[PDB]
Amino acid sequence: MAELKLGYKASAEQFAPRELVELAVAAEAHGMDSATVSDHFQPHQGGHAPFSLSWMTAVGERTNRLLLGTSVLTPTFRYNPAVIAQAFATMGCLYPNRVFLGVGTGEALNEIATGYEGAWPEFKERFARLRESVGLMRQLWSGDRVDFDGDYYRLKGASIYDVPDGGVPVYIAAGGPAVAKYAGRAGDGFICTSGKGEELYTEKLMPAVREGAAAADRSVDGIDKMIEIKISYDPDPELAMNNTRFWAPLSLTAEQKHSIDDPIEMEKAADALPIEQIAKRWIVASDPDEAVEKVGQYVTWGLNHLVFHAPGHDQRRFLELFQSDLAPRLRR
Amino acid sequence: HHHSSGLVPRGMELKLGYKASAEQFAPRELVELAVAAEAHGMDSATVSDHFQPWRHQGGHAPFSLSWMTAVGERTNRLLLGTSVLTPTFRYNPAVIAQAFATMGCLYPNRVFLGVGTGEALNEIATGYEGAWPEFKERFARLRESVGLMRQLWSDRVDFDGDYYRLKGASIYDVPDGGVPVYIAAGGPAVAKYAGRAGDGFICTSGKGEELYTEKLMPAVREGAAAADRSVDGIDKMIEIKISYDPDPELAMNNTRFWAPLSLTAEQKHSIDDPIEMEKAADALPIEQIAKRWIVASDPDEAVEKVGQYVTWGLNHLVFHAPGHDQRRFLELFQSDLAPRLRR
Structure with a gap:
């Protein structure tokens, strides 16, 4: 649903397994409603990739309230x-x-x-694979026996014997109108990432989600509209700026991110980015009022589940600052 | 004041462990039973890895790797693993x-x-x-998959097998000491492989002395020697199928859930449908199913039959109790069996 939630991005790219779990536990301690992890097999310099599903389970077993999930996994x-x-x-x-x-x-x-x-x-096949897999998984979560023969995947008399009462809500990530619309039509949730221009949210993404929801005769209000807020809020401006550097790959183009198959090729192209260009993707701020005003824009554009990704290695510092300075304002 | 890590290396004593049956219990129960195994003195707990139960009626299949991690976060001492996973x-x-x-x-x-x-x-x-x-290809797939994982574990890795590939792949976060790999073996050719490329082997009870003493053990010695490794580096694990209860009728009837284990090796590895497995398995009368199990109502007969395996060379005894009341079995184990088994 579409009540305001504040959550925490656990970056598997940046931290070893134990630290990645303990940070998510600290996120609960600090009042976050949710925590989400990137699912990667590999991120190199200071790189990590703890297995996402182990992170989910360890944090689950150690926490009481956090909503937990992937942002995102390729199924x-x-x-x-x-x-x-x-x-x-x-x-x-x-x-x-x-x-x-x-x-x-x-x-x-x-x-x-x-x-x-x-x-x-190519994108078209990756999307069709995605749609087909989501329906396959949903048939499985009915808890009945499934025979499936799609263009891509198959099941022969398969059941999931242990299915949760509330099912497994599916959140669909989109950087473009096509998948956003699929998210509106079929998603329990929708995920995007911040920092990419007012136009993307108001002109492409939000209207696409509404279009999909309308098309499938759905209440737009019942879809959790999640966004990863790229925030580099620190009263120390040097740290606010310098912390963004690790995250150069996020500032590469969409096709470099999805299609470069060589991690040497990837690090080269990330390394090629000036920090001033990296930073454009981020909310760089030393004033808490100004930071929240920037975040508040996404809430105006229709987003309700805001998941804060802070760039620096000192994540406990981020959480302290979130709790004392940002959260009270954000809650309203 | 310096504080050390306190970490004790793998460098493995008679161990008594607990089989957590994903086939029989829902996710939360399965976790909580591994926690009670620690509470009851176990050294280890292992979980079966399955997408589907052997049986349809009252069948379950919690995801093994979530069991492992949840139990990890909840326990202090238990060695934890899959027995076994198909990679x-x-x-x-x-x-x-x-x-x-x-x-x-x-x-x-x-x-x-x-x-x-x-x-x-x-x-x-x-x-x-x-x-x-066929078994030959499944064995050959297994061997290759293990080799791939060794190379991936530590560096950027290219791998080009008949079955599996890697391209520029790295595992960043590897444990100090690595990941011991235990191979399930029910014959000398897999047992040899296990000595050569594993850190442990897993067999089951009920197969008879000469399987263990004359087939499995000698083949583990041969594989390790071929690897230039002391055999004492290979943990010798056995799943002990035990239905222990002071009521003999109940100790026998408690095996019914596990009727499918009484079918042939053929049927167990090739039947693709729990409904189908179950129909085959349930036509069998209870005395036939009980044959697969150490069925005992006295601590002494129990410890005598279990102690055979220690005599044949196994050092890691993981107990699989077939009844639904697993907590009774843990209680009985700890009070009646464990003290005699330790020595």
């Missing part, structure tokens, strides 16, 4: 969607009403590295 | 390698990867196309 290539259905159904049983599945169309880098053969599929 | 079909071996590396970091010196050759009951259901491969 279409290295991961068998039936096994993903089983994994998240299990987690859903273990942490009732606290689990979601965040899905995307995929990145060449994860999939080529783990053994994908032949040409990296 | 060759529905699972990508690079992803398995990343999962266990991550778990081994989360739970230092407590995690192992237990692996086997596969059951169609897990793989056909999840979309494997074409006929279910």
Whole structure:
């Protein structure tokens, strides 16, 4: 649903497994409503990739209220969607009403590295694979026996024996109108990322979600509209600026992010970015009122679940500042 | 004042552990039973990894890797692992390698990867196309997948096998000490492989002395010698199938849930449908099913039959009790059996 939530982005790219879990526990301690993790097989310099589903489970077992999920996981290539259905159904049983599945169309880098053969599929196929996998998983979460024969995936007499009462809510990530519309039509949730220009949110994404919801005769209000807020808020401006540097890959173009299959190629192109250009993606701020005004814009544009990704290694510092300075304002 | 890590290396004593049956219990119960096993003195708990139960009526299948991590966060001492997981079909071996590396970091010196050759009951259901491969290919897939994971574990890795590939792949977060890999073995050719490329082997009870003493053990010695490794580096694990209860009728009848284990090896590895398995399995009378189990109502007969395996060379005894009341079995184990078994 579309009440205001404030959550925390746990960056698997930046931290080792134990630290990544403990940070999410600190996020609960600091009042966050949710925590979400990137799902990567590999991020190199100061790089990490703890297994996302182990992070979800460890934090679940250590926490009481956080909604937990992926932002996002590709359920279409290295991961068998039936096994993903089983994994998240299990987690859903273990942490009732606290689990979601965040899905995307995929990145060449994860999939080529783990053994994908032949040409990296074009966007259209990655989208069709995504749609087909989501329906496959949903049929499985009914808890009945499923026979499935799609263009891409198959099941023969398959059941998930252990299914949560509230099902497994599916959040669909989009950087463009096409998948946003699919999200409005079919998603329990919708995910985007901040910093990419007022136009993308108001002119492409939000109207696409409304279009999809309308098209499928759905209340737009019942879709959780989630966004990862790229915020570099620190009373120390040097840190606010300098903390963004680690995150240069996020400032590469959409096609470099999805299609570069070589991690050497990827780090080169990230390294090529001047910090001033990196920073444009981020809310760089030393004043808490100004920071919240920038975030508040997304709430005006129709987003209701705001998940804060802070760029620096000192995440506990971020959480302290979030709790004392940002959250009271953000709540309103 | 310097504080040390306190971390004790793998460097493995008679161990008594607990089999957590994903086939029989829902996710939360399965976790909580592993916690009570620690509470009751167990050294270890292992979980079966399955997409589907053996049986339909009262069947369950919680995701094994979530069990492992949840139990990890909740326990202090238990060695934890899969007995066993198939890393060759529905699972990508690079992803398995990343999962266990991550778990081994989360739970230092407590995690192992237990692996086997596969059951169609897990793989056909999840979309494997074409006929279910014969044992020779499943074994050869297993061997390759283990090799891939070794190389991935530590560096940027290219791998080009007959089955699995890697391209520029790295695992960043690897545990100090690595990830012990235990191979399920029910013959000398897999037992030899286990000595050569594993850190442990897993067998089951009920197969008879000469399987263990004359087939499995000698083959483990041969594989390790071929690896230039002391055999004392290989943990010798057995799943002890025990139905222990002071009521003999109940100790016998409590095996019915596990009727499918009484079917042939053929049926168990190739039947793809729990409804089908169950129909085959339930036509069998109870005395036939009980044959698969150590059925005992006295601590002494129990400890005599269990102690055979220690005499034949096994050092890691993981107990699988078939009844629904697992907490009774843990209670009975700790008070009646454990003190005699320790020595």
